[model samples]
Target: DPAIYFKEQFLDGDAWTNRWVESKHKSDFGKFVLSSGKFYGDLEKDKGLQTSQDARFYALSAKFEPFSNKGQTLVVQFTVKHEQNIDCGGGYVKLFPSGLDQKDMHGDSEYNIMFGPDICGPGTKKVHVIFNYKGKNVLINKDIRSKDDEFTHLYTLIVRPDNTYEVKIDNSQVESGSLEDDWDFLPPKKIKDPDAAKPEDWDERAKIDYKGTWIHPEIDNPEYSPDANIYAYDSFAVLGLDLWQVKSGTIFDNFLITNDEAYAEEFGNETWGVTKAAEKQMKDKQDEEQRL
Candidate 1:
């Protein structure tokens, strides 16, 4: 994991702003509004980035390039805490290839990892999406959603050289391996970590079998192949739940991206350099100090 360590230089005043948070509409979405020259979710109110309906959905992009290493498999990981408001405004993570012209780029090939309840209320409900020119249903754990108190959750998204994608929630393997016609259409052979256990070792249940519909597994499992459901798109953008309501608060933190072998340099950065665990420990002591 050390190979993928964060240097203080990468952070803008010790936080997640310098390495990531890009917005096509720079004037609005990612204006670097953090008063400390860092990126911190509004701790006071439900303030978050949003885009006008029919307008490019607002996104905070990272300068770290996924294509930085050619012919190498790429994976991105991050942790997010969603403040369940009446509005159901969920947070999301997205990935894109470099050299993609913001204006001319179509949204199909990129992959997205979104969580939280739908139009329905919140609590143990999550959304899993996959796109590779054609959409496919990866996995949907109805129980993936958690309460406001259960806010600490980790998420990982893997993009292999074969153009396949896999996502894991907490430590459970929620979704894995689906082919993409754009690059090298092939599903991941093994659901578990390749280095930990050989693909030949996992039980039959872990075998890769996608029901070709980019949707939450709850909606339809074992569905028709090549189906594009709600997760499908025509642009490289996303919608935060507050698009419907005006005032909302969403918190995101704890980012980790690793390969099957070991942690690689993360295209995405985080709060307080690479050692948030250490910083977080210090934070805990501060909390203890207040008690005294």
Candidate 2:
């Protein structure tokens, strides 16, 4: 038996306006809407919530009772589908403290938890998990990258009472470690021994011998060969979703926050796992049409 706190499945239009509210002032800044156009689930035809804008800010916050996980485990799981193949911008969600003005929420708003994938170009393509410890927001030490695909992917974050945490992507545990080690939650148990001393003659500044002006000995060897393809400039490049693209049509569904791992796994297996299988077929069909 586990306590379930918050759950949101944006299947209907009411879930957008009733349960969640825009954090900033009511404007076109965060263009979130409910649509059945593109989603990741068993019911692809069903509607889900999406951010329908480019080059704009989007923040949606929901209010509920401030729950405690002092003696119990905590799990936050959600499904996100980047149908636009977003190259830049965020697909992450934030969880704020209760009783805040959801309408006036902004980047400076206080949040107890922030977890999700944020991708922009090549530099940022990692999942972020921030926790407010002792009034300070601390990020986990491990780097957990998210999948950059058009299909929907499920992300899960689990925290236990023993100060350990785990991050999962599409049912696979990508990162896990003790919160104490991964985050600066508390002062370290042991510090460096100040009584230790360095040797007087230790080669602390070993300098390299400067044999200057030595060039590589070149010779016209008979075995030297030139490659047929001369374009030897090798480098790696990442594909951007679009150029300064205001990304729209990113659907989110099946958000669950619970204390039971079993419930989370079961729900993931039934919903995300099942939809993942179908998503393959959907992507295949789209690929075939494009090829033709």
Candidate 3:
């Protein structure tokens, strides 16, 4: 109970519409309605905030009590179902700082955290775990592919105070590592010491008789510096969806942010997991009934 920070099921019909503030910065924004979609495990249990417009930018946010991830584990988990077979769109959510102008949140609005799946056509299908470190957004060095299916899939990202993180999809770990090594947030562990020089008698000409002038050996970057607080961020208050969708039908629901891993997974199991099976079966039955 105390470990949970934010959790929303968006099942209260239009009551949720009161919590999420639509950005007024842009006049052409997509509309999101409470929808259970074409097929579902339960008529009302599976309802979510669905994007209902084509080629529109959706900017909406809801705020929570501001908190820091220092000396704690922060888990961001949400369920997204791209029922439209999205060709190009962003289903990601950005966590903005406290005191964010909820009505004016835009594309370039700075965020403390941005994590979720982003798919644009075939070649680009990856999850983004971008953290704004010291005012600059730094991304992980690894690429973690996301689910491209039509079913609702659970996406979870866990960032610990030890500077390590784990990414999960459908309740399974897809990627796990550290921020220091997987991101260029600090100086490399191994590098050519710029202060050190080659042996005085090192003779490359002795081997190559008639080669072009030798290029200078590579050296460590001069501006290299280490920062241990790459994964630390304070004042996480707003979770916003600032997305551009060429094809809509992205239902965002069951969002959970907490420091308890067990609770997060348990919540996912109770929500996403409970419906994953029935939804697939219902979808198959619907297709079978329509056989022509």
Candidate 4:
């Protein structure tokens, strides 16, 4: 069974205040309220934590038990709806280390992983998959971009125990690969077992394989650990938003972190997949009405 480390769906109205903490580092931090935005699948089901103001920073976080994905797969998934036509802003989330003061969380408060879509203008519409290995925040090399529309979309990132990864949008895989292939991780310690079968059906964006000479694994310094748990972080205890928006109004919902890919996709399909068509119909109706 897949383990869920963090999950959030803000449907409880004001009760969300009890769960998410807004930053006090800046008096002008934009407030976030529960809203379904301009279009939604269900009035009640689609309610999410939304950034409500423009030209301000929005920082909020929720705390969870400190845990590590040291020997397991890490699946980070969330839903974002940019219904305000989101002129310029972020739609990303970050995982912070255990000692984070949620109330004092700021943009510079380092994170273990930062993943999601960010759109500023024509030149900046990429889905950022940045990982903080050691002290550096590294990003993926591929040109993975995000949808810019008035509807909800699902984003999922799966980092495996064997140093492989997959990024999915709306339940369909848009990218996947070994950690070493996309970023700077020393080549995965070449597996020596000829009988060692690939654990999961993880495919590469292109690919890489095994069965080579028994080359001795490099015994290196503290910064270079490209083995089993290299894809994981130390102790992630809080999930938050640390970003500024020239224009706000991004609804974030259905956040989930689990160890199972199957369950993550299933949850996404049941949530985003079912209501997507109806939402599209509504959007098209609005467009036609504006045309008229």
Candidate 5:
């Protein structure tokens, strides 16, 4: 019995017109395309919003009435599918204030909270949980990894009125803690004593002496064989993890912004739980079809 806020499944043909507005700006460089088959493995195939162009900017927004969530639970979440194996760009959503100017909504826009996974190269591959505290935006100090594979993943951020928060991926808890401890919301409770100093007689250096090594007597080389074709001089393997040669194609769907964890969990079970394995079969079929 929790408060329900915003919910969007994006399955209807006119769903975009009902609750969403594609942000347009002179500085905006990319477009958001609506497609279903791009995520051929999705539970609801051929549905959701997708980033259409490469190496460009995009911001699709929606408006809702101001609902006070001061003393209740707040959950902001959405499903993202990077079927094209996104090399770069973002797949997160922003919840804005009631007075948000969709046309002028930029990075500087005042958003109440921003939660999602963003990946750009190797240095930045983590989930971002940002809260607007005291009119300033503060980010979580911990690193939360965002799934960067060619499959769908649910990103959920739950924030209670008690200043506690939790993040989940695919309904599995990834991180949780008090807001005060995780972010620099308040001044530290304790600090180093300014007048304290190290004693002069303290031995701060550490040293260890190495004794001469003793070798065993030479023994016959038994069961030792060498072949020219056995090994290569330089044998090493590496995973190609960074750099984006093409634009990341990401799909987002079934976005539910509610205050009820029970409701969210139920929705997740009804949605992801039922379709998780089927999606894999669909993907495998598509891959086989493509291969043939």
Candidate 6:
């Protein structure tokens, strides 16, 4: 038995991603499973993924039981192919909780882990770990990124009930500190001072134009119950929840959910317990065929 210790993928097929956007600029992509390589059981693409630069990019994502560990440590471990693009750009894996509905949760306390070869700059072997406490972003630590290292990088994020956090990257221990304790958290401090704000756009946006939509994840229909919808809207919501758990606020675009199980089971296990070939025939049918 697999011990149910792994995460599952949601909407893993083609119907949902035929022309979907996983990143900004509405980048179109599809899922392909690798069967033979040491990196087998991974979804990949060569040419059509969205690009911030003229470089190659690939990603694999799945849904795990959230808060399932119940304050225990959640470890996200994966291998990367160290190539030219590894330095040309970096990729991020994030975790968010349910309460992260709006942007700017930075005011609250949360822990986020970020690191990649080209994360901040070039020719550097460093991973930057940032912590968000009391609405502020703090750099907790940086670890060297090893080149040509096919080792599986491990990030153990331990979340305690007190909202404090600790970390261990590749067996190296880190400082135990409160999330609220930052490099600039002196007492009697100016919290949300008016000096930084233009004083007009800030108040007007908060008072007059304060709409809940700003903080909400941009899905096809967020409030529409998952039951009413044909696919997993709540699953997508969890994707945002994962984001909120780490970052204070984030802007998401190119939101998509594919129904083709053939595409999903190809890369990873079925997150929502779906199938692909079946979904494809369903999508390709004529107008009347859909009703029949």
Error of 5 at 117 (Å): 0.5
Question: Per-residue lDDT of 1-292 in model 6, one digit per residue for the tens?
Answer: 1113333221244443432223322242222232112221222221111222233333223333433433233333222332222323343344434444322322232433332222333455554445333455556443445432322233333434344544444334354565445333223322343333342433324452543322222233322221111101122222211211111111111121222223322322221112223322333454357588
The worst-scoring run of ten residues by lDDT in candidate 2 lies at: 231-240
Q: Whose TM-score is higher: candidate 2's or candidate 3's?
A: 3
The top-ranked prediction according to TM-score is: 3
Which residue pairs clash within candidate 3? none
Taking every candidate in turn, the Cα RMSD to the unseen true structure, in Å, is 14.4, 15.3, 3.6, 10.5, 16.9, 20.6
Model 1: lowest-lDDT 10 consecutive positions: 238-247
The reply for model 6, stretches above 4 Å from the true place, is 1-25, 28-61, 64-75, 83-85, 99-123, 133-136, 141-151, 162-164, 172-292
Q: Candidate 2 — which residues are off by over 4 angstroms? A: 26-28, 39-46, 192-246
Candidate 4 lDDT tens digits, 29-87? 88888888677778888889888888988899998888998888889899988888877
Q: Locate the minimum summed-lDDT window of 10 residues in model 3.
A: 208-217
Q: What is candidate 2's CA lDDT for residue 117?
A: 87
* Per-model TM-score versus the true fold: 0.45, 0.77, 0.90, 0.84, 0.78, 0.38
Error of 4 at 113 (Å): 0.3
Model 5 scores a TM of 0.78
| TM-score-superior candidate, 4 or 6 | 4
Query: After best superposition, candidate 1 residue 166: deviation in angstroms?
Result: 3.8
Q: Sorted by TM-score, highest first, which candidate order results?
A: 3, 4, 5, 2, 1, 6
Give me the candidate number with maximum lDDT. 3
Q: In candidate 5, which residue pairs get closer than 3 Å at backbone N, Cα or C atoms, i.e. clash?
A: 36-46, 36-47
lDDT of every model, 2 decimals = 0.38, 0.67, 0.88, 0.84, 0.66, 0.31
* Tens-place lDDT digits, model 5, residues 63-136: 65467565577787778778776677777777765655666555566666678888887787899887776667
Minimum summed lDDT over a 10-residue window in model 6 is located at 244-253
Show how many residue pairs clash in every candidate, following the order shown: 9, 2, 0, 0, 2, 20
Model 5 misplaced stretches (Cα beyond 4 Å): 39-46, 192-246
Model 2 whole-model lDDT (C-alpha atoms): 0.67
Q: At residue 178, what lDDT does model 1 achieve?
A: 45
